[PDB]
């Protein structure tokens, strides 16, 4: 069904230590394997567990002080907390081997606030070269707090207190039925009274399990606050990346827009009453998360300084391309070279890249921390280790706010005003001399909802007798955005025998008005399906391509249940290792209508040129040294796209079955 | 009336022609001379009709792809219209010769938009050096549609429809009159209808079409978007020309103010309503031109971003002020010298000079162009060839909309914001060592309107036949302010014998107040009227100077056919050939009261130092090493103006016959 990977047994030793850090995240198991080992890990006398004596005794300052208490948020967003999420990935990271990071994680795992372990935790795996190939659980397994709805965790919780079900008929009513001794609750996405308004007609994308994972992994491939140094010939372009990520959710977010309706992603001010409300269904130990009313005013007294702060961030940008020749932090810099896009996203960002700094430091200040604060619309902080949460205070929620996708489509735009600057591609570096593309065609793009369950046991409490034997078994249910495997055929016709690359890219057909996009106004709105090498013969030759090779896309992730069967076995999900930071399969398309949405495929063939061998931290860095995005990274002239090697094709995604989720959520 | 310039033959075999394309502009005539040039012009076989080979394929580049299509509004102030514009002008400019440049306009005048060749054509006519001394017809006589108020030109549309007056009396009863077999039609200035508020005062002025043509021949005379290299020695003082140009005509406008009891300009914020509002009568036979009504919000949505454009270009001149010295677009600017004023001008233009280059680029963003757009009230344009159209996208109708006076208020302000930093003159600098002004007498000063015909032809539509006859014969009359001529004497003692500068300005004597001005608060308040050397003698003398020998006025542009027949007799109007670009002299003088409206009279002495031997781009420019408007281009100390060189007299403004305009249009 899914694709496996043979896998070793000293392998299965060590996945299976990883795996085991994450079962009952918020509880601790007095005979578990993890206590007893943090129990007999003496910090203090264990200098020699680690590469770097900096780092520990960086660590040991603080934990003589004390960190964030247990059962409290953390969000990475907050100075305090993100210091001590920094020191414990240092020991993490700079562990001597897989034993004294285990050993320090069990640490960690029992003497520190949660959320905080399993931030630096996730990241750690990530990034320890020795961990590179293993495994994690979804996130949505692994916090599902912030991937429940409250409804559905009140009924969870309910089913617990009671310890089952009163009677089957009267649960079954509930939406709660019991499948192999394991409760199924049904959960509907959210209505009107969390979001107040249009924005409602996407809760199926906006609040998809999969798509907030998504950014989650996104973050933890690469988080801001470190440096891209791990990653060698890729930090000359990590600016890029940064851009090339937002332009393609945006553009993905946008075609959902379309599909149901809606136009172009709003534009704000900070001085200006912001339109979109959202009421967010989560709370915190202490906190209802914070809510946004419609026709919030973000300039009020307690957002005075953050916005004058935002504001003057903004201009010093327009500033810089007002004067061509730029110049901040150490360098001038050129708007017509390519150390310029490095430093844009850079900018926008506030990496330590922008900074040439190992780590983000304590007093430098962030635009996207700052908006996300002014645009969150929480009370400030009661002190430094307690904040009231809000969407945008996460990585995991930040997909379910339309505020985000207005912030992040505001620095695109101010990113792309730079774009402006940028020398577009001519005739000559966009044809491939003695190759034509003669014809595409796609078998039918079909959408439909189906089912999706996951394992929400991490937020449910257990007993002392219940956690000897690690226990599961509340799986949520959803009806969730999916498409049929389709194939794509490309003729070709060449003169001479080469290696090529073939990319896809899906865009809109027609604006709101119902008038065709122009490739000057439209380049930003298309999104990456595919990249891959051909083998071309001389003459007359044919390419077919299903969706389910698509290189930017992954399976479903499975539940840990599922991998500890499939470790059974030697085997493993080729997808959650070898590619988790790549958006789902099942939303590669936006939801079609019954009719066929217009939509349109472009397919363009390029010579490849030998680019060696690398170990780059995304699936988007492609062993090319073309731009991401190319030849849609920049402002377009349209007369230089009617190439013999390009080919834009009218495709219509249709829809089957049910066109609302809650129709599969309905009891009788 | 008119001064005369004898004409030679060869002279007006080239005028004749250059003036055939001004005729029946919106339509073609198959059996005219151009068209059948047209159709034998193979533009694509002829490189060398052109110095400029980039400039010659630049444009076939662009021709291949289209331009621009017929009947369509033309604005410089949309980027793509703007790049073709220059393409063209390109064109015409670097025609080796007359021959080449003839066929080239024959071309244009065929296969292009009218509006774009009417704008390219007058400026390559007034820029070629083979071109220099040749006449143009008034912008009102090529445009009408941008001087007539919409009543009118339906009035118009309507006897063409007839074909002439179904009933003399009827038709007399609207203003509508047959005169040589020529159809006149009575014009009003607008009403309350049209400015809802207090500047319908002043409607007699600011829709005057002398002094809307001359605007739209100050931007003809040096386009923002082009390098001034061309007049060589000009181009370091090109920044002082631009303010200067504003500073006086706002001088004159507040003066019409004044006597119409109306006060200072007001000021404005982009972040508040603008109160006084604009309702254009002119369409563009696809949309009407754009309303602003009273109380009009600038910063809703659509504007957020032109808003922060405007605001951080504005705040980085603050900036400038505030370091006093500074690098900026390579330069190293310091404050206190005059490459600072010059620089300073093109800041605020964002001319081709501030960047050192030839033509201004694609994405180098105006100030004046957003601030235009954001006053202008029009919704976004729909796409790169189709906007919806304000009195601020041209310059033929910029001086109607209150909103410009007050954007180039501000602009003007911040100059003398800057001009704080420039070091007064000094008793020395000022003194003339052995010259006294005993006295100055001057001659009634009487305004008042009267009458003043156009052909309007250009916005009638023929038929063939008609056209076969190149038809003319609508005119337009339209009382217009006016003064009688007068005579200013100066006495002057003096100890030896050189030759003289004199100067004339003229200045409010009292504030909306009724008290008297200071000169510390007044100095950017008059306006130059004239400027003249003199040869000065030993002891006492009196120098005459008449109002229509002043230096910076012109006579009224003589329509077509009477410029026709002057070429016949071998004559040309010399104002409309060697001061095209001067206001006119009917405006000099404000519109005064029966009473006499109390100004001043500033006459300056100072010794001639012969200098400059030029080429001149404006009147404006005289051959003196002084700057623009001194000793009035800076900061006074009110107590350096009395030396015995310098002469403030009272003088009242009279004004005869009727007060108000519309008594001039009224039937039987
Ligand atoms: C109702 O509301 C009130 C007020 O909001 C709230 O009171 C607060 O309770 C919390 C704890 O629940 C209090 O915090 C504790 O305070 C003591 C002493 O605090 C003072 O002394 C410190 C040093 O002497 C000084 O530095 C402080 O600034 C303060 O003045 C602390 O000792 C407590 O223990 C720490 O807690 C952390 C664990 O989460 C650790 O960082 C820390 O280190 C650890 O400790 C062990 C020893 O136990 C050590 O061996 C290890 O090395 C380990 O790292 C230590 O355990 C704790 O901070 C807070 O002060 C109260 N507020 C006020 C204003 O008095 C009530 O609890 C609320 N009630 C209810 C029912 O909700
Ligand atoms: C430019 O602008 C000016 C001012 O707005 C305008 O002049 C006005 O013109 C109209 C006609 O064109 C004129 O009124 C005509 O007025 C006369 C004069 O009437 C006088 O005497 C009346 C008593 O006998 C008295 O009641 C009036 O108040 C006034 O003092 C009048 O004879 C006409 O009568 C009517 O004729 C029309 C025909 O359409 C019939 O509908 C109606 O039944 C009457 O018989 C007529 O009203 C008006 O007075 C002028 N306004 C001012 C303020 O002086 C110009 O016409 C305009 N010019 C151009 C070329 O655009």
């Given at each position: ?495 001479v025998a080469t290696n090529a690359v073939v990319k896809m890219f899906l865009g809109p057909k027609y604006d709101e008005n119902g008038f065709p996009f122009s490739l000057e106004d439209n380049w930003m709105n298309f999104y990456e399906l595919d990249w891959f090498v051909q083998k071309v013969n001389p003459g ?129």
């Amino acid at each position: 069904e899914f694709k496996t990977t043979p896998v070793d047994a000293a392998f299965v030793e060590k996945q299976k230590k990883i795996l085991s850090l994450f079962y009952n995240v918020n509880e601790i198991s007095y005979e578990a394997e993890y206590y007893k080992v943090a129990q007999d890990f003496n910090i203090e006398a264990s200098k020699d567990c680690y590469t770097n004596m900096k780092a520990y005794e960086n660590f040991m300052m603080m934990y003589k002080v004390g960190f964030l208490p247990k059962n409290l948020e953390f969000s990475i967003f907050y100075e305090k907390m993100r210091e001590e999420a920094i020191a414990l990935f240092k020991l993490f990271y700079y562990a001597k081997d897989f034993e004294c990071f285990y050993k320090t994680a069990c640490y960690a795992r029992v003497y520190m606030n949660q959320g905080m372990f399993l931030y630096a935790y996730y990241i750690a795996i990530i990034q320890r070269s020795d961990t590179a190939s293993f495994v994690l659980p979804a996130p949505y397994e692994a916090y599902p707090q912030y991937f429940v709805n409250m409804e559905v965790k009140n009924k969870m919780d309910y089913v617990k207190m009671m310890d089952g079900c009163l009677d089957e008929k009267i649960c079954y009513n509930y939406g709660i039925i019991k499948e192999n001794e394991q409760f199924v609750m049904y959960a509907n996405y959210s209505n009107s009274l969390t979001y107040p308004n249009n924005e409602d007609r996407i809760a199926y994308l906006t609040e998809d399990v999969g798509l907030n994972a998504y950014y989650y992994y996104f973050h933890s491939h690469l988080p801001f606050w470190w440096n891209s140094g791990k990653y060698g010939a890729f930090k000359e372009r990590r600016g890029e990346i940064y851009f090339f990520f937002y332009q393609q959710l945006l553009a993905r977010y946008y075609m959902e827009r379309l599909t149901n309706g809606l136009g172009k992603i709003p534009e704000f001010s900070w001085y200006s009453p912001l339109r979109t409300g959202y009421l967010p269904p989560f709370n915190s130990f202490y906190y209802p998360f914070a809510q946004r009313s419609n026709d919030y005013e973000l300039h009020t007294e307690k957002n005075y300084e953050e916005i004058r702060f935002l504001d003057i961030y903004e201009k010093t940008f327009f500033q810089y391309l007002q004067q061509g020749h730029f110049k901040a932090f150490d360098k001038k810099i050129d708007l017509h070279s390519s150390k310029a896009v490095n430093f844009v996203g850079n900018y926008w960002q506030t990496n330590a890249d922008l900074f040439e700094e190992d780590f983000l430091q304590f007093y430098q200040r962030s635009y996207e921390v700052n908006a996300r604060r002014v645009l969150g619309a929480a009370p400030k902080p009661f002190n430094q280790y307690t904040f009231i949460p809000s969407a945008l205070d996460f990585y995991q929620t930040s997909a379910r706010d339309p505020a985000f996708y207005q912030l992040y489509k505001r620095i695109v735009q101010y990113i792309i005003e730079f774009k402006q600057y940028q020398v577009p591609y001519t005739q000559e570096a966009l044809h491939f001399v003695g190759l034509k593309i003669s014809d595409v065609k796609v078998d039918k793009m079909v959408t439909f909802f189906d089912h999706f369950d996951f394992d929400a046991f991490n937020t449910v409490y257990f007993s002392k007798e219940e956690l000897k034997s690690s226990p599961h078994g509340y799986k949520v249910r959803q009806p969730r955005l999916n498409h049929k495997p389709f194939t794509v055929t490309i003729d070709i016709k060449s003169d001479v025998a080469t290696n090529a690359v073939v990319k896809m890219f899906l865009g809109p057909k027609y604006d709101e008005n119902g008038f065709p996009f122009s490739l000057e106004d439209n380049w930003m709105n298309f999104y990456e399906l595919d990249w891959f090498v051909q083998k071309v013969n001389p003459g007359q030759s044919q390419i077919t391509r299903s969706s389910t090779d698509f290189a930017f896309f992954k399976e479903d992730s499975l539940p840990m249940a599922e991998i500890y069967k499939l470790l059974d076995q030697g085997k493993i999900p080729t997808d959650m290792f070898n590619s988790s930071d790549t958006m789902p399969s099942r939303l590669m398309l936006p939801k079609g209508t019954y009719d066929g949405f217009p939509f349109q495929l472009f397919v363009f063939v390029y010579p490849y040129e030998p680019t060696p061998k690398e170990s780059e931290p995304f699936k988007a860095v492609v062993p090319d040294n073309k731009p991401f995005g190319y030849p849609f990274d920049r402002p377009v002239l349209p007369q230089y796209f009617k190439q013999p090697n390009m080919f834009f094709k009218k495709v219509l995604v249709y829809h089957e079955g049910e066109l609302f989720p809650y129709l599969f959520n309905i009891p009788h």
